[PDB]
Design an enzyme around this catalytic site. Structure first.
Site, short mmCIF file in Angstrom:
data_model
loop_
_atom_site.label_atom_id
_atom_site.label_comp_id
_atom_site.label_asym_id
_atom_site.label_seq_id
_atom_site.Cartn_x
_atom_site.Cartn_y
_atom_site.Cartn_z
N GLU A 23 36.89 15.51 136.04
CA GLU A 23 36.48 15.44 137.44
C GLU A 23 35.01 15.70 137.68
OE1 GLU A 23 39.96 16.32 140.12
OE2 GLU A 23 39.48 18.22 139.13
N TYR A 37 40.65 2.50 145.80
CA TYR A 37 40.04 1.46 144.99
C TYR A 37 40.75 0.13 145.23
CZ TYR A 37 37.79 5.37 142.70
OH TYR A 37 36.99 6.49 142.46
N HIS A 60 42.58 8.70 146.41
CA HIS A 60 41.41 8.11 145.77
C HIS A 60 41.80 6.84 145.04
CE1 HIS A 60 39.49 12.39 145.37
NE2 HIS A 60 39.66 12.01 146.62
N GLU A 113 35.98 15.32 144.69
CA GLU A 113 35.86 15.59 143.25
C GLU A 113 34.96 16.79 142.98
OE1 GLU A 113 37.07 13.07 140.16
OE2 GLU A 113 37.67 14.90 141.21
N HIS A 125 37.01 19.74 143.56
CA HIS A 125 38.06 19.81 142.54
C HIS A 125 37.54 20.48 141.28
CE1 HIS A 125 40.48 16.11 144.26
NE2 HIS A 125 40.34 17.09 145.13
FE LIG Z 1 39.72 14.97 141.43
FE LIG Z 2 39.75 11.81 142.46
#
Ligand SMILES: [Fe+3]
Ligand SMILES: [Fe+3]
Ligand SMILES: [Fe+3]
Ligand SMILES: [Fe+3]
Lengths: 287, 288
Positions: free
Chosen positions: A161, A100, A96, A195, A198
């Site tokens: 998260e 970006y 992740h 996410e 998660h």
């Molecule tokens: Fe995460």
């Molecule tokens: Fe993440």
């Protein structure tokens, strides 16, 4: 010393989460984002600045989650199957974060990118909010932790998260919902798909640990959890004012922050604390 | 507080290792092992027992590398790009550990599998070996570590990754080099492809830290490194005797252990400590 044995279940959920995290595996090379330049130029300077700042903040949060939150929580779990899932999640946080940088390479010059990261490093609200979360993780840097310490680190992780990322995810979703930066928006949706699972998983683990605590320890962490929720909420409201006043979105983002705080609470098995409002319909179109 | 910025390199190698680790991504569902049953049944009882024991030992080592070694080394790195690589490597250790369960499901009954894992847990040499390695990782459970502590954890990691696994990898490769258990052999080869790059990478990180140590600290960790190599070697020789005497392979495996100890040393930038002996030729065919 025990080796992980997947032929004897340690719980009822780690295998399904293992398979789902793996099934969702992706890397940034999969989404080309050069086509977003056409809509990037249609944004104003203020819109572009807001976008870069929020992505900078998200990158910081993922950096800390992959480099501190997942590693230190997982080291102290006794359940070896759940530990396996957290290790994979931590790797995905690094995917992740790196994604970006893939977006930035298309939308900014090298000099503009190193301005983003300088702004992140010196930013006081990002420093404060990240410092609050990572203080719980850094409490686990010792040979033996208590279950209260582990529980609170899991709470901090769920709040990161399921809650703290959303003041930032709002804007890529809002633009994508308007047909702008849609390739970057696809990346953000892949991040959010991860996410989401998660926060659910860590929240399951937290609920299990909570039920093992003494009544006195339960009362202590219940109060600390509610204080932490609102301490972070005060900081998020300051952050949204700073980022979004220039583009007229502060109250919209605040509504979205509350919606996601409630989701984080639900992932911990706790009741919502903010009034239920429906998700902004433009953001919904971006999802 | 700093966020990882991949548009400004923190070193000359993390990106290449990141890309390679990702390019090598795999999971155990990709390799079906059912067809190994036809050669499994041809093994003697003693051969089957040795195979199951080695794979149980390998599972233990990966369990500790994914759940202690990678997390505790990475948490103390200042280089956020290298931290990223280690986090991915740690996830792959969990994939490795889980792949041994996928092999076991084909080769053993539910009861036989739980017997493997009970034998692992109560095994004194596996406990001693894993305890020695993980003592270096557990030293890092504190807010402030020294570079000697971090360097020695990286040394322990390289020794696990490039050296300690090889007394176990020998036998799957030896059987596969003869056409036996070739599907499981394919999995072991995917694991080795990852492990080789793991040890190279951690060895690069260790060499960078070493160069920052004072001369006094350098000579202290050099001594600890040579002693650890030999402490592990004594245990590995006991382990090979225990596992392989029943099937006549003790000296062959010991040669392989020494060969991979030398590789571990070279990954740390150190000279070999064992005489050069070419790899068992059947093992080499199992690697082909
Ligand atoms: Fe995460
Ligand atoms: Fe993440
Ligand atoms: Fe491995
Ligand atoms: Fe490895």
């Amino acid at each position: 010393m025990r080796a992980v044995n997947w032929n004897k279940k340690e719980d009822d959920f780690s295998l399904m989460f293992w398979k789902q995290n793996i099934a969702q595996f992706w890397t940034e090379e999969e989404i080309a984002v050069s086509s977003d330049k056409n809509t990037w130029v249609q944004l104003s300077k203020e819109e572009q600045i807001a976008y870069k700042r929020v992505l900078g903040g998200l990158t910081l949060l993922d950096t800390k989650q992959g480099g501190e939150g997942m590693p230190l929580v997982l080291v102290h779990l006794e359940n070896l199957q759940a530990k396996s899932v957290l290790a994979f999640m931590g790797a995905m946080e690094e995917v992740h974060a790196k994604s970006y940088s893939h977006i930035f390479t298309t939308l900014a010059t090298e000099e503009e990118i190193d301005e983003i990261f300088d702004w992140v490093d010196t930013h006081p609200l990002l420093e404060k909010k990240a410092g609050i979360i990572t203080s719980y993780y850094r409490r686990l840097l010792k040979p033996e932790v208590t279950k209260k310490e582990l529980y609170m680190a899991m709470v901090a992780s769920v709040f990161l998260e399921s809650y703290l990322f959303y003041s930032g995810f709002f804007y890529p979703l809002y633009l994508a919902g308007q047909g702008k930066l849609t390739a970057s928006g696809e990346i953000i949706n892949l991040i959010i798909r991860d996410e989401s699972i998660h926060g659910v998983f860590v929240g399951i683990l937290a609920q299990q640990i909570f039920a093992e605590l003494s009544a006195e320890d339960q009362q202590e962490v219940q109060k600390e959890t509610q204080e932490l929720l609102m301490e972070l909420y005060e900081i998020e409201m300051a952050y949204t004012e700073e980022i979004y006043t220039s583009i007229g979105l502060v109250e919209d983002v605040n509504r979205f922050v509350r919606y996601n705080a409630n989701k984080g609470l639900m992932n911990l098995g706790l009741e919502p604390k903010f009034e239920e409002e429906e998700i902004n319909p433009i953001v919904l179109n971006g999802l």
